[PDB]
């Protein structure tokens, strides 16, 4: 369970594990939001 | 949406500083003494009276009392001119306090208000009438 | 975090223009610390004590003793442990220090007592036991209600209604007894009605049916919830506290009937509104000394005696605060005196939730410990517990 | 009389309102400089200046002059005490004036100035209580600061209002008199 | 909050069996490598979308699964006493 | 009539009207699928 303490490899997961027809559910507790994380990921991957 | 705004808490305003300089601006010789007497009076009657749902002894009530005190001091000055020198500033403040706070009280809280007024200001008396027409 | 980093970048851009390194004194330490103590991190802070805690954290951490080497960021354990600040000057070195840090942490890392984590860990163990039991499992009533109904009300018999004095304390005590008697009369009428409809010839009404349903569920009715309800307590816990408050009010009324009202050692937890009592005794001192209400300050030692005060993470010893790992300890008797004009200033809350601050008390400091350490450990005084 | 469009001449009215307020503010700042540079002040010309210029303009020009004097004092101890003495002398003149009977418009215009000068007095007292290195000290950068540069040809963007690493151009919207707020530490 | 599907489990099959790292080429050791990788990847993928409170519960369940699969004698009575014996009824006046 | 959500509530009238056929997954079927898939991954010609 040492992998869980590291931050998410979101680019690897969305490039390999995630099928195109399966949505990526970015659940969060109140006080947290991952939309900025996805925007940063898109900026890294140069995707519109 | 919360990330697009910068938050800041507004919990308790400085009622002493709010009252003192505006009494100074309206023009009062004992402005600091009146300010030091009126804010603790409001804080004390906010809880020593009965807990009615229509009671409000906050900043809006205090500011309305101070504005009314300035207005009635100007009215007294105009009445003297019709008839600046020294004026009963404490009596003016008590007149504004009575005219703003007395009508909201229940029947068992008016003597309590007058006891608080006598405790804070010794020379209080009362002003009423003058509505013959 | 992003706003703080942007402010740091803006301040460094304003200070230096392309310089490779800056001296620690030329860094706007006070500017950055005040700016993110008042606007960035202190914006959402509601309490003055939380603001003081944030201020002392920022003041201890971000002065760094002007980038002093081997700076003590914190203590890992209160006894024989430390965290050393890394001397690297690069993101790679800081990241390496981060993974070099040990995985298992303790609440003493935060300047907190270690006993705050014990209840949470026990609750988490019970919860995971219950979850494993859940997966393993996957792999009349009104007579008992009437029995409890007949079991409760014997602790309450009567209360006076309560009568024309100008004392600042007497009228407050009288109105306290007044709404206490009103609530007690309403409770007695409800109990008599439900007794009549459960054992007798009386049909069910809507209000009494809702009372039956809510009392069987175990939630306090909103009608009985006049004063503060701590974090949604249960009815069996609330009824005993309500009985003790009634007993205190009965003692107050008996002593007033026989001023003698000053000699009563009132419990602050038994009062419906506690702060009104403190302001009432402030006005009593003011009218006794012919002084002003605002100028009277607090000097509390362990001429008005209060009881039922519990601390949090410290103990009292001849008006001296000593840190202890115990959760709480009880003050037998506490007296308050009013005088117009390093020390520690503790907050006093009604309950353990600390959702409503009542008033603050200034004590005397210990010889060995640091006021920042007191604030980080978070010593307070509780009443209704 | 040339029959322009309603929106066109309304836009002209708005823009030239802003430019007129900027010009009047420039003349007002010149007058406050030539008045409050000295220690003693003359109420007989103080009343005429206040009756001449608008309430927002007199309050803002007092703020501009006080900020400029404190900036000059910090550029260079004793000049800070000179600024405090000027503030207290103006406060005494203000107190005497509100003790006299006055029309309501000038009474409000004068009460606003009393409030602003009391706030300036408090800032000066706290700043003297603290220690100053230069104009880059945060104890001075934490307050609202006003700067005037008459050399600029763009009179609309001539006034600059500055907080700690914050720069603002005055919008020059006509606010009339309105109600001025008391600057508490919570307000700061 | 976490509902998992047989399609999800088949996806983790397609992501473990096909793209297994270090593709030992021996039918004996590849079985153990596939087994260990399947347990670890299952824990990782399930724990991506569940709370840190329940992370340890899922890990202990996977430890129970590994004990059942292994040869190792599972202490069924001790496991049942750890699970349900915490709420067992005790003797009167004990 | 077909559905993909097993955690759906049907009204009693529709329950009376229709015959329910639930396609749940069983341990034996899951083990058979797992054995077939590990055969295809390890020995594809043998599986065919």
GROMACS .gro file of C-alpha atoms in nm, chain C:
model
  385
  182UNK     CA    1  -0.167   2.741  -0.130
  183UNK     CA    2  -0.170   2.885  -0.483
  184UNK     CA    3  -0.255   3.233  -0.354
  185UNK     CA    4   0.027   3.215  -0.097
  186UNK     CA    5   0.275   3.100  -0.363
  187UNK     CA    6   0.161   3.379  -0.596
  188UNK     CA    7   0.210   3.637  -0.320
  189UNK     CA    8   0.558   3.497  -0.248
  190UNK     CA    9   0.646   3.518  -0.619
  191UNK     CA   10   0.511   3.874  -0.644
  192UNK     CA   11   0.702   3.990  -0.335
  193UNK     CA   12   1.029   3.835  -0.456
  194UNK     CA   13   0.979   3.984  -0.804
  195UNK     CA   14   0.925   4.326  -0.646
  196UNK     CA   15   1.229   4.282  -0.419
  197UNK     CA   16   1.488   4.145  -0.663
  198UNK     CA   17   1.514   4.174  -1.042
  199UNK     CA   18   1.698   3.870  -1.176
  200UNK     CA   19   1.936   3.837  -0.881
  201UNK     CA   20   2.070   3.487  -0.822
  202UNK     CA   21   2.044   3.493  -0.441
  203UNK     CA   22   1.900   3.714  -0.167
  204UNK     CA   23   2.015   3.757   0.191
  205UNK     CA   24   1.766   3.625   0.452
  206UNK     CA   25   1.719   3.970   0.607
  207UNK     CA   26   1.627   4.127   0.272
  208UNK     CA   27   1.342   3.875   0.237
  209UNK     CA   28   1.015   4.048   0.338
  210UNK     CA   29   0.950   3.814   0.631
  211UNK     CA   30   0.714   4.042   0.824
  212UNK     CA   31   0.539   4.150   0.503
  213UNK     CA   32   0.467   3.795   0.387
  214UNK     CA   33   0.376   3.671   0.736
  215UNK     CA   34   0.135   3.957   0.807
  216UNK     CA   35  -0.016   3.940   0.457
  217UNK     CA   36  -0.099   3.570   0.477
  218UNK     CA   37  -0.195   3.599   0.845
  219UNK     CA   38  -0.454   3.867   0.768
  220UNK     CA   39  -0.573   3.789   0.414
  221UNK     CA   40  -0.477   3.443   0.286
  222UNK     CA   41  -0.493   3.195   0.575
  223UNK     CA   42  -0.648   3.425   0.836
  224UNK     CA   43  -0.940   3.524   0.614
  225UNK     CA   44  -1.155   3.225   0.706
  226UNK     CA   45  -1.053   3.232   1.074
  227UNK     CA   46  -1.353   3.322   1.291
  228UNK     CA   47  -1.212   3.298   1.645
  229UNK     CA   48  -0.952   3.523   1.805
  230UNK     CA   49  -0.788   3.216   1.962
  231UNK     CA   50  -0.760   3.044   1.624
  232UNK     CA   51  -0.617   3.369   1.485
  233UNK     CA   52  -0.361   3.373   1.768
  234UNK     CA   53  -0.273   3.009   1.696
  235UNK     CA   54  -0.222   3.087   1.327
  236UNK     CA   55  -0.016   3.394   1.418
  237UNK     CA   56   0.214   3.203   1.653
  238UNK     CA   57   0.257   2.920   1.400
  239UNK     CA   58   0.355   3.172   1.131
  240UNK     CA   59   0.582   3.367   1.366
  241UNK     CA   60   0.763   3.056   1.489
  242UNK     CA   61   0.803   2.894   1.147
  243UNK     CA   62   0.859   3.167   0.889
  244UNK     CA   63   1.121   3.375   1.068
  245UNK     CA   64   1.348   3.063   1.047
  246UNK     CA   65   1.587   3.254   1.277
  247UNK     CA   66   1.694   3.415   0.947
  248UNK     CA   67   1.753   3.085   0.764
  249UNK     CA   68   1.941   2.930   1.056
  250UNK     CA   69   2.083   2.585   0.986
  251UNK     CA   70   1.943   2.282   1.173
  252UNK     CA   71   1.624   2.473   1.252
  253UNK     CA   72   1.378   2.282   1.470
  254UNK     CA   73   1.063   2.274   1.258
  255UNK     CA   74   0.887   2.083   1.537
  256UNK     CA   75   0.939   1.804   1.788
  257UNK     CA   76   0.840   1.456   1.671
  258UNK     CA   77   0.775   1.335   2.027
  259UNK     CA   78   0.760   1.553   2.338
  260UNK     CA   79   1.044   1.342   2.478
  261UNK     CA   80   1.374   1.284   2.293
  262UNK     CA   81   1.279   1.347   1.930
  263UNK     CA   82   1.324   1.622   1.672
  264UNK     CA   83   1.277   1.712   1.306
  265UNK     CA   84   1.576   1.882   1.143
  266UNK     CA   85   1.519   2.128   0.861
  267UNK     CA   86   1.696   2.012   0.542
  268UNK     CA   87   1.982   2.221   0.408
  269UNK     CA   88   1.913   2.151   0.041
  270UNK     CA   89   1.841   2.445  -0.189
  271UNK     CA   90   1.660   2.260  -0.470
  272UNK     CA   91   1.324   2.097  -0.534
  273UNK     CA   92   1.501   1.764  -0.584
  274UNK     CA   93   1.670   1.789  -0.243
  275UNK     CA   94   1.343   1.885  -0.073
  276UNK     CA   95   1.164   1.592  -0.240
  277UNK     CA   96   1.444   1.359  -0.130
  278UNK     CA   97   1.404   1.481   0.229
  279UNK     CA   98   1.029   1.421   0.193
  280UNK     CA   99   1.069   1.054   0.095
  281UNK     CA  100   1.344   1.018   0.355
  282UNK     CA  101   1.092   1.117   0.623
  283UNK     CA  102   0.938   0.816   0.803
  284UNK     CA  103   0.592   0.704   0.696
  285UNK     CA  104   0.438   0.664   1.043
  286UNK     CA  105   0.362   0.998   1.210
  287UNK     CA  106   0.224   1.091   1.552
  288UNK     CA  107   0.001   1.383   1.660
  289UNK     CA  108   0.293   1.530   1.859
  290UNK     CA  109   0.433   1.636   1.518
  291UNK     CA  110   0.169   1.912   1.518
  292UNK     CA  111   0.245   2.047   1.865
  293UNK     CA  112  -0.058   1.854   1.993
  294UNK     CA  113  -0.089   1.609   2.283
  295UNK     CA  114  -0.067   1.246   2.175
  296UNK     CA  115  -0.393   1.148   2.348
  297UNK     CA  116  -0.610   1.329   2.090
  298UNK     CA  117  -0.548   1.047   1.840
  299UNK     CA  118  -0.644   0.767   2.081
  300UNK     CA  119  -1.022   0.814   2.063
  301UNK     CA  120  -1.009   0.849   1.684
  302UNK     CA  121  -0.798   0.534   1.647
  303UNK     CA  122  -1.028   0.336   1.878
  304UNK     CA  123  -1.332   0.456   1.681
  305UNK     CA  124  -1.163   0.359   1.353
  306UNK     CA  125  -1.084   0.013   1.490
  307UNK     CA  126  -1.445  -0.032   1.601
  308UNK     CA  127  -1.561   0.089   1.258
  309UNK     CA  128  -1.339  -0.155   1.068
  310UNK     CA  129  -1.457  -0.435   1.299
  311UNK     CA  130  -1.816  -0.339   1.214
  312UNK     CA  131  -1.735  -0.329   0.842
  313UNK     CA  132  -1.578  -0.675   0.853
  314UNK     CA  133  -1.888  -0.795   1.038
  315UNK     CA  134  -2.099  -0.641   0.759
  316UNK     CA  135  -1.909  -0.831   0.489
  317UNK     CA  136  -1.927  -1.148   0.701
  318UNK     CA  137  -2.305  -1.109   0.734
  319UNK     CA  138  -2.326  -1.063   0.357
  320UNK     CA  139  -2.118  -1.379   0.315
  321UNK     CA  140  -4.583  -0.382   2.263
  322UNK     CA  141  -4.343  -0.096   2.190
  323UNK     CA  142  -4.579   0.151   2.360
  324UNK     CA  143  -4.563  -0.055   2.680
  325UNK     CA  144  -4.185  -0.011   2.700
  326UNK     CA  145  -4.229   0.356   2.606
  327UNK     CA  146  -4.473   0.396   2.897
  328UNK     CA  147  -4.231   0.212   3.127
  329UNK     CA  148  -3.955   0.461   3.042
  330UNK     CA  149  -4.213   0.741   3.069
  331UNK     CA  150  -4.300   0.636   3.425
  332UNK     CA  151  -3.929   0.584   3.499
  333UNK     CA  152  -3.817   0.940   3.413
  334UNK     CA  153  -4.035   1.203   3.583
  335UNK     CA  154  -3.978   1.127   3.954
  336UNK     CA  155  -3.664   1.344   3.957
  337UNK     CA  156  -3.880   1.654   3.894
  338UNK     CA  157  -4.150   1.769   4.137
  339UNK     CA  158  -4.217   2.146   4.122
  340UNK     CA  159  -4.059   2.486   4.063
  341UNK     CA  160  -4.154   2.840   4.163
  342UNK     CA  161  -4.253   3.094   3.900
  343UNK     CA  162  -4.090   3.405   4.055
  344UNK     CA  163  -4.017   4.010   4.292
  345UNK     CA  164  -3.919   4.375   4.239
  346UNK     CA  165  -3.551   4.459   4.294
  347UNK     CA  166  -3.290   4.670   4.116
  348UNK     CA  167  -3.003   4.426   4.170
  349UNK     CA  168  -2.826   4.329   3.844
  350UNK     CA  169  -2.797   3.967   3.964
  351UNK     CA  170  -3.142   3.917   4.118
  352UNK     CA  171  -3.343   4.001   3.805
  353UNK     CA  172  -3.119   3.783   3.587
  354UNK     CA  173  -3.163   3.493   3.830
  355UNK     CA  174  -3.539   3.555   3.838
  356UNK     CA  175  -3.574   3.549   3.459
  357UNK     CA  176  -3.355   3.236   3.450
  358UNK     CA  177  -3.597   3.069   3.693
  359UNK     CA  178  -3.883   3.211   3.485
  360UNK     CA  179  -3.804   3.040   3.157
  361UNK     CA  180  -3.680   2.732   3.343
  362UNK     CA  181  -4.021   2.705   3.506
  363UNK     CA  182  -4.190   2.765   3.170
  364UNK     CA  183  -3.992   2.482   3.008
  365UNK     CA  184  -4.054   2.255   3.308
  366UNK     CA  185  -4.429   2.325   3.299
  367UNK     CA  186  -4.442   2.245   2.927
  368UNK     CA  187  -4.246   1.922   2.984
  369UNK     CA  188  -4.475   1.822   3.272
  370UNK     CA  189  -4.787   1.891   3.063
  371UNK     CA  190  -4.646   1.677   2.780
  372UNK     CA  191  -4.559   1.393   3.019
  373UNK     CA  192  -4.903   1.405   3.184
  374UNK     CA  193  -5.073   1.401   2.843
  375UNK     CA  194  -4.874   1.102   2.718
  376UNK     CA  195  -4.935   0.918   3.048
  377UNK     CA  196  -5.308   0.984   3.003
  378UNK     CA  197  -5.315   0.863   2.642
  379UNK     CA  198  -5.103   0.554   2.711
  380UNK     CA  199  -5.280   0.441   3.031
  381UNK     CA  200  -5.629   0.588   3.021
  382UNK     CA  201  -5.927   0.686   2.809
  383UNK     CA  202  -5.772   0.949   2.584
  384UNK     CA  203  -5.717   0.945   2.208
  385UNK     CA  204  -5.397   1.040   2.026
  386UNK     CA  205  -5.333   1.393   1.900
  387UNK     CA  206  -5.094   1.506   1.628
  388UNK     CA  207  -4.846   1.678   1.859
  389UNK     CA  208  -4.848   1.388   2.105
  390UNK     CA  209  -4.811   1.137   1.820
  391UNK     CA  210  -4.506   1.324   1.690
  392UNK     CA  211  -4.372   1.329   2.047
  393UNK     CA  212  -4.426   0.952   2.072
  394UNK     CA  213  -4.249   0.887   1.741
  395UNK     CA  214  -3.956   1.118   1.818
  396UNK     CA  215  -3.914   0.987   2.174
  397UNK     CA  216  -3.917   0.626   2.049
  398UNK     CA  217  -3.657   0.728   1.789
  399UNK     CA  218  -3.449   0.891   2.063
  400UNK     CA  219  -3.410   1.247   1.931
  401UNK     CA  220  -3.483   1.552   2.144
  402UNK     CA  221  -3.803   1.728   2.034
  403UNK     CA  222  -3.754   2.075   1.892
  404UNK     CA  223  -4.011   2.210   2.140
  405UNK     CA  224  -3.797   2.109   2.439
  406UNK     CA  225  -3.481   2.239   2.265
  407UNK     CA  226  -3.490   2.594   2.400
  408UNK     CA  227  -3.127   2.646   2.500
  409UNK     CA  228  -2.814   2.501   2.339
  410UNK     CA  229  -2.822   2.130   2.249
  411UNK     CA  230  -2.461   2.000   2.232
  412UNK     CA  231  -2.405   1.823   1.898
  413UNK     CA  232  -2.744   1.650   1.907
  414UNK     CA  233  -2.735   1.461   2.236
  415UNK     CA  234  -2.977   1.183   2.328
  416UNK     CA  235  -3.288   1.219   2.542
  417UNK     CA  236  -3.164   0.994   2.824
  418UNK     CA  237  -2.848   1.207   2.851
  419UNK     CA  238  -3.043   1.533   2.829
  420UNK     CA  239  -3.302   1.447   3.095
  421UNK     CA  240  -3.041   1.407   3.371
  422UNK     CA  241  -2.872   1.738   3.288
  423UNK     CA  242  -3.217   1.902   3.275
  424UNK     CA  243  -3.296   1.755   3.619
  425UNK     CA  244  -2.968   1.890   3.760
  426UNK     CA  245  -3.042   2.233   3.612
  427UNK     CA  246  -3.387   2.219   3.775
  428UNK     CA  247  -3.225   2.126   4.108
  429UNK     CA  248  -2.986   2.421   4.079
  430UNK     CA  249  -3.275   2.656   3.998
  431UNK     CA  250  -3.470   2.519   4.295
  432UNK     CA  251  -3.171   2.582   4.522
  433UNK     CA  252  -3.144   2.936   4.382
  434UNK     CA  253  -3.514   3.002   4.445
  435UNK     CA  254  -3.497   2.857   4.797
  436UNK     CA  255  -3.193   3.069   4.886
  437UNK     CA  256  -3.356   3.381   4.739
  438UNK     CA  257  -3.672   3.316   4.942
  439UNK     CA  258  -3.454   3.253   5.252
  440UNK     CA  259  -2.805   3.975   4.962
  441UNK     CA  260  -2.768   3.599   5.006
  442UNK     CA  261  -2.773   3.549   4.627
  443UNK     CA  262  -2.404   3.647   4.607
  444UNK     CA  263  -2.288   3.360   4.831
  445UNK     CA  264  -2.425   3.085   4.603
  446UNK     CA  265  -2.155   2.884   4.424
  447UNK     CA  266  -2.341   2.862   4.094
  448UNK     CA  267  -2.237   2.606   3.834
  449UNK     CA  268  -2.175   2.773   3.499
  450UNK     CA  269  -2.277   2.458   3.311
  451UNK     CA  270  -2.623   2.458   3.469
  452UNK     CA  271  -2.717   2.804   3.342
  453UNK     CA  272  -2.924   2.848   3.027
  454UNK     CA  273  -2.713   3.147   2.918
  455UNK     CA  274  -2.367   3.162   3.086
  456UNK     CA  275  -2.233   3.493   2.953
  457UNK     CA  276  -2.526   3.688   3.096
  458UNK     CA  277  -2.412   3.581   3.444
  459UNK     CA  278  -2.057   3.707   3.383
  460UNK     CA  279  -2.186   4.041   3.255
  461UNK     CA  280  -2.430   4.060   3.547
  462UNK     CA  281  -2.154   4.014   3.804
  463UNK     CA  282  -1.947   4.267   3.607
  464UNK     CA  283  -2.232   4.516   3.646
  465UNK     CA  284  -2.256   4.422   4.015
  466UNK     CA  285  -1.888   4.507   4.064
  467UNK     CA  286  -1.935   4.825   3.859
  468UNK     CA  287  -2.228   4.946   4.072
  469UNK     CA  288  -2.046   4.848   4.392
  470UNK     CA  289  -1.733   5.045   4.298
  471UNK     CA  290  -1.914   5.325   4.104
  472UNK     CA  291  -1.703   5.244   3.797
  473UNK     CA  292  -1.751   5.181   3.425
  474UNK     CA  293  -1.853   4.848   3.275
  475UNK     CA  294  -1.596   4.844   2.993
  476UNK     CA  295  -1.289   4.912   3.208
  477UNK     CA  296  -1.344   4.613   3.440
  478UNK     CA  297  -1.106   4.334   3.340
  479UNK     CA  298  -1.078   3.970   3.450
  480UNK     CA  299  -0.843   3.840   3.720
  481UNK     CA  300  -0.950   3.481   3.794
  482UNK     CA  301  -0.783   3.263   4.058
  483UNK     CA  302  -0.842   2.898   4.139
  484UNK     CA  303  -1.533   3.733   4.493
  485UNK     CA  304  -1.776   3.509   4.303
  486UNK     CA  305  -1.737   3.131   4.320
  487UNK     CA  306  -1.813   2.909   4.021
  488UNK     CA  307  -1.787   2.531   3.997
  489UNK     CA  308  -1.789   2.254   3.738
  490UNK     CA  309  -1.499   2.373   3.522
  491UNK     CA  310  -1.291   2.113   3.337
  492UNK     CA  311  -0.961   2.182   3.161
  493UNK     CA  312  -0.818   2.021   2.847
  494UNK     CA  313  -0.465   1.882   2.837
  495UNK     CA  314  -0.335   2.065   3.145
  496UNK     CA  315  -0.373   2.082   3.523
  497UNK     CA  316  -0.390   2.367   3.773
  498UNK     CA  317  -0.148   2.391   4.066
  499UNK     CA  318  -0.175   2.709   4.279
  500UNK     CA  319  -0.275   2.930   3.983
  501UNK     CA  320  -0.003   2.775   3.766
  502UNK     CA  321  -0.078   2.574   3.452
  503UNK     CA  322   0.117   2.250   3.403
  504UNK     CA  323   0.083   2.046   3.085
  505UNK     CA  324  -0.034   1.688   3.129
  506UNK     CA  325  -0.127   1.408   2.891
  507UNK     CA  326  -0.462   1.355   3.064
  508UNK     CA  327  -0.770   1.452   2.863
  509UNK     CA  328  -0.923   1.672   3.132
  510UNK     CA  329  -0.918   1.751   3.502
  511UNK     CA  330  -1.174   1.916   3.728
  512UNK     CA  331  -1.149   2.244   3.918
  513UNK     CA  332  -1.327   2.210   4.256
  514UNK     CA  333  -1.383   2.581   4.320
  515UNK     CA  334  -1.293   2.886   4.112
  516UNK     CA  335  -1.330   3.248   4.220
  517UNK     CA  336  -1.345   3.558   4.000
  518UNK     CA  337  -1.239   3.914   4.079
  519UNK     CA  338  -1.262   4.228   3.866
  520UNK     CA  339  -0.984   4.489   3.848
  521UNK     CA  340  -0.971   4.780   3.602
  522UNK     CA  341  -0.598   4.733   3.537
  523UNK     CA  342   0.445   3.660   2.955
  524UNK     CA  343   0.101   3.525   3.051
  525UNK     CA  344  -0.137   3.274   2.895
  526UNK     CA  345  -0.501   3.357   2.821
  527UNK     CA  346  -0.735   3.059   2.809
  528UNK     CA  347  -1.079   3.037   2.646
  529UNK     CA  348  -1.381   2.906   2.834
  530UNK     CA  349  -1.641   2.716   2.633
  531UNK     CA  350  -1.982   2.582   2.729
  532UNK     CA  351  -1.924   2.228   2.601
  533UNK     CA  352  -1.664   2.005   2.437
  534UNK     CA  353  -1.767   2.106   2.084
  535UNK     CA  354  -1.642   2.465   2.141
  536UNK     CA  355  -1.902   2.585   1.890
  537UNK     CA  356  -1.993   2.882   2.114
  538UNK     CA  357  -1.721   3.079   2.293
  539UNK     CA  358  -1.843   3.221   2.623
  540UNK     CA  359  -1.561   3.423   2.779
  541UNK     CA  360  -1.185   3.421   2.825
  542UNK     CA  361  -0.966   3.379   3.134
  543UNK     CA  362  -0.605   3.489   3.184
  544UNK     CA  363  -0.399   3.254   3.403
  545UNK     CA  364  -0.035   3.256   3.511
  546UNK     CA  365   0.227   3.087   3.296
  547UNK     CA  366   0.450   2.793   3.382
  548UNK     CA  367   0.822   2.844   3.433
  549UNK     CA  368   0.953   2.585   3.187
  550UNK     CA  369   0.706   2.587   2.897
  551UNK     CA  370   0.660   2.839   2.611
  552UNK     CA  371   0.336   3.030   2.537
  553UNK     CA  372   0.353   2.911   2.177
  554UNK     CA  373   0.362   2.554   2.311
  555UNK     CA  374   0.056   2.627   2.528
  556UNK     CA  375  -0.133   2.767   2.229
  557UNK     CA  376  -0.033   2.477   2.001
  558UNK     CA  377  -0.140   2.221   2.261
  559UNK     CA  378  -0.467   2.412   2.287
  560UNK     CA  379  -0.552   2.443   2.655
  561UNK     CA  380  -0.910   2.551   2.727
  562UNK     CA  381  -1.173   2.533   3.002
  563UNK     CA  382  -1.500   2.343   2.961
  564UNK     CA  383  -1.816   2.380   3.171
  565UNK     CA  384  -2.095   2.141   3.065
  566UNK     CA  385  -1.916   1.808   3.080
   0.00000   0.00000   0.00000
